[PDB]
């Protein structure tokens, strides 16, 4: 058999991947790159096999020939007797989150405010909110809509990176990896929690998982849900309990991609590796947990219960859905 070469984005993911590799007896090994696009290029070169991707990145990968292999499945809201690996995925809710104390702010008054995004090209952080904004403004000038932002991956000298903070030394400002303090779901929600931004574009789960003691991290440990509101597209504000009626879209779950010629092997190896290290895995927590992180959401989201089989051997466009693909393609016309 062959080893599966994972691709880690930045040094915190590389550390995690090296722990997994040791525990897996080198059944998985690691390559590392600075950005998710650079990992996609290692996989297209055949210098890595696979990584797990937000849907916006699945679109970049898919356009280049890479295919979806298994998807993240989080705990289901409804009871199901199916094993996690065979349960249909449910999609997560992209939302716009503000502080309750910032009383004036609604969807219709976002212009010239300060925004926090997970990264350029990601679903809830960027494609859904910027795609809605370009459409409602009738303008491609989305880089001038908010007065300042943290949108990791944008030009570091531009207003889209002005709120980004880089690493403990302030290097790497705005890089789209976990060294940037405000990267990703948890970094963009921290940007809002600290009042660096007025609005954070994240998912529903992020607000719940970083409030009311669900996170023990210093900046989160004291946050209360009731201090946040969601912005609905009809201009209203709701409590964060109301995400099923106050979201921007439903996003396709993050998923593992590979070259087509390696998909089957990556799939088989992942199904085995989560039996060992996944939730309730044979060697989790004793030795290693694939879906927990030293920091946050490294390699996979920490709320992943398993990687699940996909139905219908779907192409990347089937997995993302036609409506999401068409929205991404419309937004990418601006660039």
């Amino acid at each position: 058999y062959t080893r599966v070469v994972w691709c880690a984005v930045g040094p915190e993911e590389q550390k995690k991947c090296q722990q997994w590799s040791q525990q897996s007896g080198q059944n998985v090994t690691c390559a590392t790159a600075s950005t998710t696009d650079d990992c996609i290029v290692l996989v297209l070169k055949g210098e890595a096999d696979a990584l797990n991707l937000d849907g916006g990145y699945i679109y970049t990968a898919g356009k280049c020939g890479l295919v979806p292999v298994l998807a993240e499945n989080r705990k289901s809201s409804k009871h199901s007797s199916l094993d996690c690996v065979l349960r249909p995925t449910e999609g997560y809710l992209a939302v716009a989150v503000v502080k309750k104390a910032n009383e004036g702010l609604t969807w219709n008054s976002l212009k010239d405010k300060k925004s926090c995004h997970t990264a350029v090209d990601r679903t809830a952080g960027w494609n859904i909110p910027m795609g809605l904004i370009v459409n409602q403004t009738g303008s491609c000038a989305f880089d001038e809509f908010f007065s300042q932002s943290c949108a990791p991956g944008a030009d570091p000298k531009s207003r889209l990176c002005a709120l980004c903070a880089g690493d403990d030394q302030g290097l790497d400002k705005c890089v789209p990896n976990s060294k940037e303090k405000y990267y990703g779901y948890t970094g963009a929600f921290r940007c809002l929690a600290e009042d660096v931004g007025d609005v954070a574009f994240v998912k529903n789960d992020t607000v719940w998982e970083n409030t009311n003691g669900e996170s023990t991290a210093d900046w989160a440990k004291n946050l209360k849900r009731e201090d946040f509101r969601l912005l609905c597209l009809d201009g209203t504000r709701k409590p964060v309990t109301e995400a099923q009626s106050c979201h921007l879209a439903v996003a396709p779950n993050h998923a593992v991609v590979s070259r087509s010629d390696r998909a089957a092997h990556v799939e088989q190896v992942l199904l085995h590796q989560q039996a060992l290290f996944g939730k309730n895995g044979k060697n989790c927590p004793d030795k290693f947990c694939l879906f927990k992180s030293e920091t946050k959401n490294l390699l996979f989201n920490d709320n992943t219960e398993c990687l699940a089989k996909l139905g219908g051997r779907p192409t990347y466009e089937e997995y993302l859905g036609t409506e999401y693909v068409t929205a991404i393609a419309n937004l990418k016309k601006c660039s």
């Binding site: 297209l44 356009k63 280049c64």
Partner: peptide
């Protein structure tokens, strides 16, 4: 609606 970005 086009080619690979790389």
């Amino acid at each position: 609606l086009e080619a690979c970005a790389f």
